[PDB]
């Protein structure tokens, strides 16, 4: 009452602002991971922990930062379910491709029709887990975006949970590396 209606209000100030700071840090982190040539390497740390959060049903899937086909090209990002989705639930590692709403969409040709290659890098450069595909032209996943993101589309059975995790060379120092390569032919 005396002068607490202000301080107990400043505390609500610091607190309602502290959330804006979390936003900004997220945007800076995003600019730092963005690429503009269609190639994107995604490092995932605290693999052990994040694997549990998937199995324990707590956190099913994670999105990766965005990247583009060119400075003013398509905006995209990946989405992974460390414990499977659809046909690969509890058995495989599900990796998907996402076309996001980009600031230059109006200037781009649709639907999205570029080959996409996805891989789980073997930190021993021995045998990489690779897979590729050509967009399903009629699928809503590759039409000009209306929302922030379209429906992810990719490889629900990308890699057997047993293959990675276990040991091998895919997981090393509690972290993995996912790679995507978007073919630029035509663009």
């Amino acid at each position: 009452e005396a002068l607490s209606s202000k301080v107990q209000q400043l505390e609500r100030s610091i607190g309602l602002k502290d959330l804006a700071m979390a936003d900004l840090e997220q945007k800076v982190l995003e600019m730092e991971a963005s690429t503009y040539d269609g190639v994107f390497i995604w490092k995932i740390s605290d693999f052990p922990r994040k694997r549990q959060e998937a199995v324990a049903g707590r956190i099913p899937a994670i999105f990766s930062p965005a990247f583009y086909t060119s400075r003013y090209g398509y905006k995209m990002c990946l989405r992974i379910y460390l414990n499977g989705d659809g046909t690969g639930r509890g058995t495989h590692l599900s990796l998907f491709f996402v076309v996001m709403k980009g600031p230059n969409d109006a200037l781009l040709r649709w639907p999205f029709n570029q080959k996409v290659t996805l891989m789980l890098l073997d930190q021993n450069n021995r045998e990489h887990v690779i897979d590729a595909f050509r967009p399903d032209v009629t699928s809503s996943s590759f039409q000009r975006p209306v929302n922030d993101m379209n429906i992810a589309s990719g490889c629900p059975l990308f890699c057997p949970v047993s293959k990675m995790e276990a040991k091998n060379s895919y997981v090393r120092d509690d972290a993995i590396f996912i790679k995507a390569i978007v073919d630029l032919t035509g663009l």
Binding site: A61, G86, I151, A152, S153
Partner: peptide, 9 residues
């Protein structure tokens, strides 16, 4: 490509 599941996430 196979689309992701509506519920999965």
């Amino acid at each position: 490509p196979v689309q992701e599941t509506l519920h999965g996430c």
